């Protein structure tokens, strides 16, 4: 179970990293929506990660 939680935690961390890459892409793109989505997703994930 501990290993499973770690894997889930790792996935959340990976998702945040993926979102960060998207955010970098968003800045070049200049689209407000893409940047906003990444920031919101990162915050909830961080809270979830803390709980995990």
């Amino acid at each position: 179970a501990q290993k499973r939680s770690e894997k889930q935690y790792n996935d959340a961390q990976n998702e945040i990293n993926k979102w960060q890459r998207n955010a970098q892409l968003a800045l070049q793109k200049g689209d407000e929506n893409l940047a906003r989505q990444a920031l919101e997703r990162k915050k909830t994930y961080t809270d979830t990660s803390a709980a995990l």
Binding site: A23, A26, L27, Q28, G30, E32, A35, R36, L39, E40
Partner: peptide, 11 residues
């Protein structure tokens, strides 16, 4: 968040 986004958009 919007203010932060605007700075990012400037790139």
């Amino acid at each position: 968040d919007e203010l932060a986004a605007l700075k990012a958009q400037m790139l």
